Amino acid sequence: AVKIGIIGGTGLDDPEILEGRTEKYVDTPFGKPSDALILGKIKNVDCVLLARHGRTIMPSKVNYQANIWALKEEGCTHVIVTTACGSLREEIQPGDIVIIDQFIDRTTMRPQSFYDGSHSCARGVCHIPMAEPFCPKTREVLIETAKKLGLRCHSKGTMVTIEGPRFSSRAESFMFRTWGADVINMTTVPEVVLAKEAGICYASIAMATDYDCWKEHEEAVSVDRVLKTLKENANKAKSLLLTTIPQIGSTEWSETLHNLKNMAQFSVLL
Amino acid sequence: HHENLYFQSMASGAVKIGIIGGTGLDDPEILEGRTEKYVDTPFGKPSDALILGKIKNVDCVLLARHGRQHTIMPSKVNYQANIWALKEEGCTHVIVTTACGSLREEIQPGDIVIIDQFIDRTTMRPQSFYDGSHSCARGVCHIPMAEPFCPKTREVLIETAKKLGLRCHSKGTMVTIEGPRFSSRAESFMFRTWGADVINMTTVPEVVLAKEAGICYASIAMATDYDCWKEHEEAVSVDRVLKTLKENANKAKSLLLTTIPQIGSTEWSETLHNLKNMAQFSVLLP
Amino acid sequence: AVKIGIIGGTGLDDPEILEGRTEKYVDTPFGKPSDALILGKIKNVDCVLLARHGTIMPSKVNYQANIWALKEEGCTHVIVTTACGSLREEIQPGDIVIIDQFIDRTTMRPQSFYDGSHSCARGVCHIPMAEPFCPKTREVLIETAKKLGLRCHSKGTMVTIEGPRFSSRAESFMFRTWGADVINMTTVPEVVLAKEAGICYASIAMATDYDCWKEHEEAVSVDRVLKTLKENANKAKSLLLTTIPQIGSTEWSETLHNLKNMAQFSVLL
Numbered sequence: 001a002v003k004i005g006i007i008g009g010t011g012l013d014d015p016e017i018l019e020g021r022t023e024k025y026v027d028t029p030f031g032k033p034s035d036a037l038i039l040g041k042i043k044n045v046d047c048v049l050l051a052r053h054g055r056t057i058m059p060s061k062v063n064y065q066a067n068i069w070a071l072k073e074e075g076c077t078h079v080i081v082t083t084a085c086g087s088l089r090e091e092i093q094p095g096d097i098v099i100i101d102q103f104i105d106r107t108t109m110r111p112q113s114f115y116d117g118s119h120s121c122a123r124g125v126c127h128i129p130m131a132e133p134f135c136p137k138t139r140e141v142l143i144e145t146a147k148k149l150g151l152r153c154h155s156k157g158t159m160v161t162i163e164g165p166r167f168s169s170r171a172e173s174f175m176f177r178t179w180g181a182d183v184i185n186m187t188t189v190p191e192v193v194l195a196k197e198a199g200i201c202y203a204s205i206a207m208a209t210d211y212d213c214w215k216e217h218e219e220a221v222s223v224d225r226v227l228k229t230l231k232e233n234a235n236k237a238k239s240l241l242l243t244t245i246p247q248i249g250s251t252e253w254s255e256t257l258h259n260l261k262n263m264a265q266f267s268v269l270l
Numbered sequence: 271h272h273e274n275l276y277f278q279s280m281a282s283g284a285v286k287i288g289i290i291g292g293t294g295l296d297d298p299e300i301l302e303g304r305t306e307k308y309v310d311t312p313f314g315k316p317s318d319a320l321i322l323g324k325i326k327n328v329d330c331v332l333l334a335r336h337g338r339q340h341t342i343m344p345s346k347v348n349y350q351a352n353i354w355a356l357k358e359e360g361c362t363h364v365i366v367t368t369a370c371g372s373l374r375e376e377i378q379p380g381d382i383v384i385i386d387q388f389i390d391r392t393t394m395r396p397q398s399f400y401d402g403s404h405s406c407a408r409g410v411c412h413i414p415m416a417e418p419f420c421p422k423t424r425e426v427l428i429e430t431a432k433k434l435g436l437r438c439h440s441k442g443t444m445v446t447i448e449g450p451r452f453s454s455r456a457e458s459f460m461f462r463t464w465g466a467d468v469i470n471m472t473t474v475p476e477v478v479l480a481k482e483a484g485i486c487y488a489s490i491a492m493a494t495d496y497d498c499w500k501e502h503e504e505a506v507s508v509d510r511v512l513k514t515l516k517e518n519a520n521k522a523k524s525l526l527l528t529t530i531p532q533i534g535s536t537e538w539s540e541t542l543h544n545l546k547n548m549a550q551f552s553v554l555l556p
Numbered sequence: 557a558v559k560i561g562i563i564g565g566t567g568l569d570d571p572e573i574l575e576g577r578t579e580k581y582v583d584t585p586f587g588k589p590s591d592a593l594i595l596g597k598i599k600n601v602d603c604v605l606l607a608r609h610g611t612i613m614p615s616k617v618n619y620q621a622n623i624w625a626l627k628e629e630g631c632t633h634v635i636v637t638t639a640c641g642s643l644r645e646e647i648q649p650g651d652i653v654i655i656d657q658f659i660d661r662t663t664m665r666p667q668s669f670y671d672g673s674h675s676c677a678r679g680v681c682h683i684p685m686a687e688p689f690c691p692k693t694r695e696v697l698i699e700t701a702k703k704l705g706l707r708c709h710s711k712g713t714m715v716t717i718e719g720p721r722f723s724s725r726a727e728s729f730m731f732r733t734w735g736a737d738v739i740n741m742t743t744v745p746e747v748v749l750a751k752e753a754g755i756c757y758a759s760i761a762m763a764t765d766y767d768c769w770k771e772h773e774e775a776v777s778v779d780r781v782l783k784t785l786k787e788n789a790n791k792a793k794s795l796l797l798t799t800i801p802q803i804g805s806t807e808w809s810e811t812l813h814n815l816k817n818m819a820q821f822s823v824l825l
């Protein structure tokens with residue numbers, strides 16, 4: 001029974017889309033999620049929407065633990081998120097989609113495990129594998145769905161997640177390029193890590209909104225530029241989600257989820 | 271439009287320089303109309319009292335980063351309180367000095383580096399005023415860092431160093447490490463490959479916060495050692511840094527003393543207006 | 557008077573090895589060590605054994621308390637063993653690496669005793685890290701590995717990640733480009749703190765996997781690490797046991813004097 005948690009689900013909380021709507025504030029052993037969980041069906045598939053920043057909060061301080069724990073406890077099998085990001089590559093243009101497959105962690109202040117010694121709900125030490133952080137099957141549906149829509153889309157990409165809330169210096173932007181990063185943001189880590197500990201199939205839709213500050217004869221990133229590009233291109237990620245959702249619903253998952261569950265279980269030392 | 275014109279003394283309808291690490295400037299021969307003032311901020315107490323006065327007829331505010339008696343690790347300096355206090359005093363500009371390690375052969379111990387970029391290797395440090403917990407700084411601030419250092423100040427610093435005939439480097443990338451330990455040799459080498467030119471423990475987040483405050487910030491970096499990457503050269507130690515600082519402090523002091531009046535006679539309204547705008551348009555609110 | 561603190565001393569707590577055994581729980585100004593200190597003689601050399609995980613995630617190990625306790629017991633030397641991932645083809649699972657450098661990728665960890673909050677450690681300490689690992693110990697380790705005929709690497713850079721998660725593949729690749737050779741979760745800040753304490757510290761790294769960078773190879777997992785450790789723990793144990801008496805017979809007065817001076821002259825008061 002597929003149930004899709006959606007974080008950053010641009011415009012999905014709408015009576016024309018979300019049927020049987022219901023809104024639910026929850027508590028978790030890690031605290032309160034960013035906002036109420038919005039429950040309903042989209043194209044006959046059970047979904048749970050969660051707004052990452054609420055509606056106020058810096059990326060460093062988002063309660064990623066509470067957010068993922070809540071989605072797990074609601075019964076989500078899948079999580080699909082959207083994020084804005086900066087492009088670190090010429091061929092990734094503003095407005096393009098990137099179905100990211102890897103990350104580089106540049107965060108510093110963020111808890112990244114549920115298994116923190118302090119919670120009876122998550123006993124022991126968890127060393128979760130991260131060789132493949134993102135759900136391959138969901139990513140493949142995202143890719144094929146983008147092609148069906150005729151959208152500019154990149155099939156793979158490495159996201160460097162910085163601590164923020166400041167944007168990167170130019171020396172930093174250049175060094176990230178040399179480390180192999182393709183796109184840059186402030187939220188992928190530790191969301192992806194925690195979803196993996198929870199045995200959830202997690203994938204990210206990244207939309208490039210600027211070229212950070214590395215580029216020649218190009219204007220550097222600002223809040224205003226991001227906000228304008230998002231406004232011009234949000235419709236893309238929304239169509240992609242909306243078209244992906246029913247395909248997730250009709251796909252077989254038992255083996256995929258069984259392996260995720262085993263991987264998470266055998267990562268824990270008691 | 272408006273020209274700032276005078277006629278028979280009358281005009282129709284203001285630089286203040288915060289100085290952090292201001293080597294030897296707290297001296298009656300230099301600082302005229304001295305006054306000393308302990309302050310509170312919404313982010314706590316600054317490292318030390320603010321020393322107020324005029325230097326070559328320009329209003330200045332001196333602040334010791336490690337406090338009087340150099341008692342605090344770079345990780346635990348209250349950068350928020352320091353920058354907020356300088357802002358609240360009315361500083362338009364901040365000029366700091368820092369010691370640093372050289373990562374490049376051509377940056378010799380004793381050389382000045384007018385840095386233009388940084389690489390953050392800190393881990394423990396608040397880097398914004400807009401932290402959700404202060405009514406004085408509401409919302410989320412994503413401040414741009416493409417050009418972290420005030421270009422106009424940097425230019426005056428460069429041209430002033432040339433006038434004095436000092437060995438000086440016009441650009442440079444500072445890697446700021448968390449400390450208080452110095453870098454391993456593997457770290458030192460990797461920093462070189464990332465493009466860092468000098469190394470220290472304080473530039474981040476001082477530079478970031480000044481930018482959020484709409485202050486024109488520049489740094490005078492003085493190389494005191496070659497860190498530990500170098501052949502037929504002895505590695506950094508507290509004692510080597512101290513010795514090199516002592517031999518070379520007169521340089522940064524002259525540089526400042528000669529820069530100060532040039533900042534005072536330069537036009538800033540447009541520069542500060544743009545900084546103010548950049549800071550304002552960085553903040554998100556519902 | 558040589559006294560060897562041993563962290564991760566796989567199988568040394570045994571009546572056939574540790575003579576005059578005694579077990580001692582201690583308090584330090586930085587809290588409780590991971591576990592009791594096990595005191596005794598191994599091949600007539602005074603040792604102190606400490607179990608690093610006592611259960612506890614690497615981020616939350618009390619490295620300060622562990623090193624302080626070993627210092628307070630009089631340890632002149634610390635020799636540790638660590639599992640690690642290999643970032644190089646020629647460092648095979650089961651190999652020993654006598655590491656000589658580190659790259660810090662930790663974020664949450666106190667790395668000094670001189671934290672402003674302890675009268676036992678007043679002021680600011682800027683310890684040098686050009687040579688984080690005791691050269692003389694390392695040389696004995698290398699020569700001893702050769703005598704035993706073990707596969708051993710004379711140098712190596714350890715990247716210490718925060719954990720508890722393993723690295724992504726993008727991370728694994730980038731660590732290679734930075735010059736790291738092996739990967740773990742504990743070397744930093746253990747090595748740093750031992751240096752502040754004036755202790756000659758060296759590390760025996762045993763590769764247990766190839767992390768996740770490699771082709772035609774299966775990625776790291778808790779189960780793979782554990783299996784490889786089980787098959788190869790004997791090697792580090794024989795190496796320690798054979799190193800210990802050579803440390804005992806070596807002259808150290810100048811080496812320790814210089815470490816003591818280096819630590820002392822690092823402190824601003």
Ligand SMILES: CCCCSC[C@H]1CN(Cc2c[nH]c3c(N)ncnc23)C[C@@H]1O
Binds near residue numbers: 084086211
């Ligand atoms: C209300 C809409 C406008 C928001 S602008 C600030 C957002 C954008 N987020 C992602 C983001 C896009 N480009 C980036 C870049 N170059 N570097 C790092 N992050 C990014 C992070 C952040 O919290």
Ligand SMILES: CCCCSC[C@H]1CN(Cc2c[nH]c3c(N)ncnc23)C[C@@H]1O
Binds near residue numbers: 370371469682
């Ligand atoms: C005035 C007291 C001098 C004590 S020496 C330690 C000082 C020097 N600061 C800068 C500094 C110079 N060389 C460096 C190097 N190689 N790496 C990193 N920082 C540096 C950092 C620190 O707070």
Ligand SMILES: CCCCSC[C@H]1CN(Cc2c[nH]c3c(N)ncnc23)C[C@@H]1O
Binds near residue numbers: 127717739740778
């Ligand atoms: C006895 C417990 C075994 C559980 S496996 C997880 C252990 C192994 N430690 C070292 C370790 C080996 N391979 C590594 C890799 N690829 N990356 C990072 N650390 C490693 C870190 C950690 O605390």
Ligand SMILES: [Cl-]
Binds near residue numbers: 106391661
């Ligand atoms: Cl880093």
Ligand SMILES: [Cl-]
Binds near residue numbers: 083186188
């Ligand atoms: Cl983000």
Ligand SMILES: [Cl-]
Binds near residue numbers: 368369470471
């Ligand atoms: Cl510094």
Ligand SMILES: [Cl-]
Binds near residue numbers: 614638639741742743
């Ligand atoms: Cl480890």
